[PDB]
Amino acid sequence: RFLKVKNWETDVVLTDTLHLKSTLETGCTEHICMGSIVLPTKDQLFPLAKEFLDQYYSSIKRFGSKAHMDRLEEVNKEIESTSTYQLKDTELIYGAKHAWRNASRCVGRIQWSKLQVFDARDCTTAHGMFNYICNHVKYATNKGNLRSAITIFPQRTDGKHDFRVWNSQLIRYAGYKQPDGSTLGDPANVQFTEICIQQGWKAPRGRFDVLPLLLQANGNDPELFQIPPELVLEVPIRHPKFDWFKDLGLKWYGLPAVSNMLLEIGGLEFSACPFSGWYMGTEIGVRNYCDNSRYNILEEVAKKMDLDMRKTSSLWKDQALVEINIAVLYSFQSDKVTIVDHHSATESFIKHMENEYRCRGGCPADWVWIVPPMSGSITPVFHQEMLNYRLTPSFEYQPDPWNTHVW
Amino acid sequence: RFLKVKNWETDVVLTDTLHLKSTLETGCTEHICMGSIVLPVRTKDQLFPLAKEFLDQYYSSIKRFGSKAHMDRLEEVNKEIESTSTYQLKDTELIYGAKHAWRNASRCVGRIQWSKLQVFDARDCTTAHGMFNYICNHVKYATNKGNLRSAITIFPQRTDGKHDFRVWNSQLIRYAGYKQPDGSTLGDPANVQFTEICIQQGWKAPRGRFDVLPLLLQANGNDPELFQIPPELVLEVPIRHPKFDWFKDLGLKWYGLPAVSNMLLEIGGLEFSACPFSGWYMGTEIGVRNYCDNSRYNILEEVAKKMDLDMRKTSSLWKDQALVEINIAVLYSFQSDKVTIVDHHSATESFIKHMENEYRCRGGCPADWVWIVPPMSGSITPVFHQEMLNYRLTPSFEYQPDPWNTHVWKG
Ligand code: HEM
Ligand code: HEM
Ligand SMILES: Cc1cc(N)nc(C[C@H]2CNC[C@H]2OCCNCCc2cccc(F)c2)c1
Ligand SMILES: Cc1cc(N)nc(C[C@H]2CNC[C@H]2OCCNCCc2cccc(F)c2)c1
Ligand SMILES: C[C@H](O)[C@H](O)[C@H]1CNc2nc(N)[nH]c(=O)c2N1
Ligand SMILES: C[C@H](O)[C@H](O)[C@H]1CNc2nc(N)[nH]c(=O)c2N1
Ligand SMILES: [Zn+2]
Numbered sequence: 001r002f003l004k005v006k007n008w009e010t011d012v013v014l015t016d017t018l019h020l021k022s023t024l025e026t027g028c029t030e031h032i033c034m035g036s037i038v039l040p041t042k043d044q045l046f047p048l049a050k051e052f053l054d055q056y057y058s059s060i061k062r063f064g065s066k067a068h069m070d071r072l073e074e075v076n077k078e079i080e081s082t083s084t085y086q087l088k089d090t091e092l093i094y095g096a097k098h099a100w101r102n103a104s105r106c107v108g109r110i111q112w113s114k115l116q117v118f119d120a121r122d123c124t125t126a127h128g129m130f131n132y133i134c135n136h137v138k139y140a141t142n143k144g145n146l147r148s149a150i151t152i153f154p155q156r157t158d159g160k161h162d163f164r165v166w167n168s169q170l171i172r173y174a175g176y177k178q179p180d181g182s183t184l185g186d187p188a189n190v191q192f193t194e195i196c197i198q199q200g201w202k203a204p205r206g207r208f209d210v211l212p213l214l215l216q217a218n219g220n221d222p223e224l225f226q227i228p229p230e231l232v233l234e235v236p237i238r239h240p241k242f243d244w245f246k247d248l249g250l251k252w253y254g255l256p257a258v259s260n261m262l263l264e265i266g267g268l269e270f271s272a273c274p275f276s277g278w279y280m281g282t283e284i285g286v287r288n289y290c291d292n293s294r295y296n297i298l299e300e301v302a303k304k305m306d307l308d309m310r311k312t313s314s315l316w317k318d319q320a321l322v323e324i325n326i327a328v329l330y331s332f333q334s335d336k337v338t339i340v341d342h343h344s345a346t347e348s349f350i351k352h353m354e355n356e357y358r359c360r361g362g363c364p365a366d367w368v369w370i371v372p373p374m375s376g377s378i379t380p381v382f383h384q385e386m387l388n389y390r391l392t393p394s395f396e397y398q399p400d401p402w403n404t405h406v407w
Numbered sequence: 408r409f410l411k412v413k414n415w416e417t418d419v420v421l422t423d424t425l426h427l428k429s430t431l432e433t434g435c436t437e438h439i440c441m442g443s444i445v446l447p448v449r450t451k452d453q454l455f456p457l458a459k460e461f462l463d464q465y466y467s468s469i470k471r472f473g474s475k476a477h478m479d480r481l482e483e484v485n486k487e488i489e490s491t492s493t494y495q496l497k498d499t500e501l502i503y504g505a506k507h508a509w510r511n512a513s514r515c516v517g518r519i520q521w522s523k524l525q526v527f528d529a530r531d532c533t534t535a536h537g538m539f540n541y542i543c544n545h546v547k548y549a550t551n552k553g554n555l556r557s558a559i560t561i562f563p564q565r566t567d568g569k570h571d572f573r574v575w576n577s578q579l580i581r582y583a584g585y586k587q588p589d590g591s592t593l594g595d596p597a598n599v600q601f602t603e604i605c606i607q608q609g610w611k612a613p614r615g616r617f618d619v620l621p622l623l624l625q626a627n628g629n630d631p632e633l634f635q636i637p638p639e640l641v642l643e644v645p646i647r648h649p650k651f652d653w654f655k656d657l658g659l660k661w662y663g664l665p666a667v668s669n670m671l672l673e674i675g676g677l678e679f680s681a682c683p684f685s686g687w688y689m690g691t692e693i694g695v696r697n698y699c700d701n702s703r704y705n706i707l708e709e710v711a712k713k714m715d716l717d718m719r720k721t722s723s724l725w726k727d728q729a730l731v732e733i734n735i736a737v738l739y740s741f742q743s744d745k746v747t748i749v750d751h752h753s754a755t756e757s758f759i760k761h762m763e764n765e766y767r768c769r770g771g772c773p774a775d776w777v778w779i780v781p782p783m784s785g786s787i788t789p790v791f792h793q794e795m796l797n798y799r800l801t802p803s804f805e806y807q808p809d810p811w812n813t814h815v816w817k818g
Contacts, residue, residue, distance in 0.1 A: 003439075003628075005443070005444070008445060009700070009701055009702050017611060019439055022438050022439070024436045025438065026436070026438060026439060026440045027440075028433065028435035028436065028437065028439075028440045028442070029435065029437060030432040030435065031425050031426065031429050031432065031433065031797045032410075032429065032433060032434060032435075032797065033434075033435050033440065033442050033775075033796070033797035033798070034440075034443075034796065035435075035440050035442030035443070035776065035777070035797065036415070036442070036701060036776035036777075036793075036794055036797075036798065037412070037796075038792050038794065038796045039413065047708065049608055066435070073413070083590050189745055200760060228731040232744045251699045258662035277801050279637075280728050281722075286786055286787075287786060288616060289788065290786070290787055291416070291712070291792075292416055293415075293416050300789065311751035312753050313690075313733065313738045313742065313753070314750075315731055315734055315735045315738070315750070317730045317752065317784070317787050318734070318783065318784045318787070319731055319735075321784060321787055322724055322727045322728055322731055325724060325727070326723065326728075329722045331720070331722070331772075341724070343721040343722075343726065344721055344722070355423065367442065367443035367777060368442070368443075368776060368777065371785070372785075372793065373785045373786035374699075374727065374728060374782070374784055374785060374786065374787075375726065375783050376727050376780070376781075376782045376784065377695050377696060377699070377700065377782030378695075378699060378707070378730055378782075378783075379725070382782065384443075385443055385444050385445065386443050387440070387441065387444075388439070388440035388442065388443075389438060389439045389440070
């Protein structure tokens with residue numbers, strides 16, 4: 001019922017009680033661990049609403065106060081007659097901040113309480129959505145001094161009137177299959193790129209073409225829009241010691257902004273809730289640049305470093321990985337664009353985890369995702385036992401809209 | 408019910424049915440994943456079904472399920488359980504048992520090799536000196552002058568839990584750790600407690616950074632006694648770097664034979680509490696963990712110092728730069744001295760081929776991602792991108808409490 005987590009580098013032991021709150025299911029059983037799987041009515045809504053308002057009023061030190069009870073009845077009455085309900089601004093902000101706080105896969109949660117929340121619940125059209133997104137992008141970008149933000153479109157109703165951003169992130173590079181059999185640009189985005197092409201985008205067909213936004217308001221067919229190029233802060237990638245690195249022609253965007261997740265607060269479902277912070281270096285240098293199924297540049301870089309690629313045991317992939325990552329961090333720093341290295345990020349998360357254990361009685365954490373994709377064991381999170389469980393408010397994955405949406 | 412796992416690099420999707428044979432529990436529930444927690448006298452009653460399951464598996468694999476020899480063996484085991492409270496494994500069942508415990512070890516990346524395991528039957532052993540002799544033979548056989556061979560030696564099973572055979576060392580070969588009065592540690596800080604115990608048992612400690620510990624060996628529930636492994640039996644590799652000539656002056660070395668001696672081997676309900684086993688190293692175990700963990704030799708600072716890296720900001724990735732160089736040095740040193748070692752690229756590619764093979768021929772391969780993914784360069788190894796299902800099959804190796812915590816001292 002109570003559970004201990006040990007850090008095997010420091011011997012520091014923490015006791016978790018927060019897990020006894022969790023309701024949603026992990027995918028694991030007593031018989032099987034699914035820890036490494038990427039994806040494992042009116043009557044439904046009121047317990048959900050109640051459970052959320054209870055944690056809200058307890059957080060503002062007013063649990064069981066008349067103002068608490070009154071709000072419970074007003075929501076109960078609104079559900080009974082409207083089959084849904086509306087969140088107060090204060091509840092919206094709290095819900096969003098807590099969905100981030102509860103994101104067990106996110107290493108950057110030390111920052112959870114400083115999230116700028118933009119309420120776009122009054123939005124009605126895709127042109128409206130575009131305006132809100134551009135304002136979000138400009139606000140978060142802040143000329144390189146990045147700030148966390150989320151923008152929240154109207155909640156689901158009958159599920160036939162969904163707001164969706166079809167893009168997976170607000171800013172991403174296009175992907176084309178070429179006659180060659182090779183891929184130009186980002187292979188992750190090939191399918192979405194074609195969907196933009198069949199919707200009518202003129203594609204420049206380069207390595208680093210910023211995709212257009214494809215915006216669905218109120219269940220209607222989605223619409224193309226190009227983000228003013230002047231709102232998209234990008235960094236050219238160079239190396240502090242290797243002069244040849246510039247000729248690889250590498251660039252990345254400053255703003256990571258996930259736009260395909262669903263935000264659930266008090267049983268209400270916000271299907272379009274783009275949010276953004278800033279990069280940890282490895283996301284770009286390890287995953288985007290080096291995954292065999294992404295830009296996959298390890299082979300090209302190793303060649304320029306004149307390393308022995310004859311045998312895997314020369315650790316040439318590993319040498320090139322480090323240098324690719326040094327260059328990402330150097331480039332973002334030199335251009336004054338916020339970025340965090342994996343040493344700094346994981347050390348912060350350990351500090352945050354200790355805060356959450358003393359202040360909240362726990363911190364749900366998914367070790368498979370929190371440990372960086374390079375140098376795992378020289379980061380302190382490697383040695384940290386973590387407990388993974390699902391709390392609400394939360395961000396969840398949802399089906400790609402094109403599989404779903406009817407034209 | 409069939410369970411699917413997907414490789415996110417290749418889109419290969421595999422179907423697991425083997426998890427259906429899984430008996431033991433994971434630590435996890437529908438409400439909590441304990442996937443990163445390091446650790447989350449049997450009676451006649453419980454013993455017969457365990458013996459029966461095991462023998463059903465054995466007889467299946469040799470294609471004799473339901474045979475008169477299968478039925479006769481069940482009845483003979485049954486009769487022996489009721490009459491004596493335990494039973495004895497045939498040699499063939501012991502071999503099969505030991506190979507399967509390795510096959511089932513979900514935290515082990517080296518399993519492609521599971522079927523080539525030299526089993527030494529030491530169930531006729533009775534004394535600590537007998538144990539020492541069996542262990543020297545294992546070490547010489549396994550070492551094979553650098554062309555390492557996988558092996559396990561199996562001492563007598565638990566009886567009443569008062570007569571246990573235990574190897575008190577956690578590996579057959581490991582270096583002492585000495586905690587100094589100024590709070591520094593000389594040698595391997597992981598072995599401080601055990602070293603203290605050796606010392607108190609009368610070991611005279613050289614007190615260097617690389618003193619090979621003595622063996623502390625318990626037979627038949629008796630008090631353990633000290634033995635020194637003959638030095639000529641302990642193959643060691645001095646560590647140098649192919650390009651950096653100052654690397655050798657760090658004074659590093661490591662032993663070639665990794666030989667886990669503190670686990671419990673369970674087969675058909677029987678408990679083998681001393682069953683040391685050994686293979687060969689994957690380079691990262693030494694280069695990443697043993698050398699670079701902050702709680703271990705911790706040489707990152709001193710290495711990066713000698714590499715003249717920028718150390719005033721973590722964002723120069725100086726730690727990462729030094730880590731790779733150390734790992735290069737380890738592999739180079741082993742290869743140069745013709746001592747078997749495997750790099751993490753090669754080992755993980757092998758594991759993936761093993762795992763796909765196992766799904767096809769066996770209907771699954773239990774695997775613990777937290778453990779299989781190497782402690783450096785995770786995502787450029789194909790395992791990182793592999794979904795895995797973790798569950799407990801028997802035969803199995805299990806953790807057991809350190810014997811100094813449980814042992815009843817006789818005097
Ligand atoms: C501010 C600096 C931040 C950093 C350094 C950061 C870091 C990360 C990283 C490295 C991941 C792993 C994702 C992957 O590898 O694909 C992640 C996941 C995630 N983060 Fe953050 N984060 C930040 C801000 C935010 C904010 C503002 C939110 C929401 C308000 C958020 C919510 C999430 C969620 C929901 C996931 C899981 C995505 C998934 O399951 O695929 N993060 N975070
Ligand atoms: C042939 C060469 C082998 C290689 C390269 C190899 C590789 C490894 C590695 C890297 C680990 C993780 C250890 C750690 O980081 O703490 C491990 C764990 C393990 N291996 Fe192997 N292995 C080999 C052979 C064997 C053999 C012969 C056995 C026994 C028959 C064995 C059984 C195990 C077990 C039971 C674990 C789990 C240890 C634990 O939970 O602490 N392996 N293997
Ligand atoms: C807000 C924020 C800040 C930050 N630094 N980093 C992030 C994660 C972003 C960026 N870097 C990856 C992306 O993570 C979000 C995408 N999650 C992948 C899960 C997935 C499941 C199934 C199929 C797939 F192809 C992918 C968010
Ligand atoms: C047979 C074989 C071959 C090989 N290459 N590698 C191995 C694992 C060895 C080597 N390198 C580490 C050790 O693994 C065995 C010890 N396992 C640690 C688990 C643990 C539990 C509780 C507390 C702890 F601090 C640690 C075995
Ligand atoms: C199969 C495995 O679960 C998958 O590759 C995961 C592993 N850990 C991860 N960790 C992070 N931060 N991001 C990812 O995309 C993944 N992928
Ligand atoms: C807390 C965490 O599970 C622990 O540090 C584990 C992580 N993965 C590991 N993986 C291997 N192979 N060996 C280890 O010792 C560990 N340590
Ligand atoms: Zn689990």
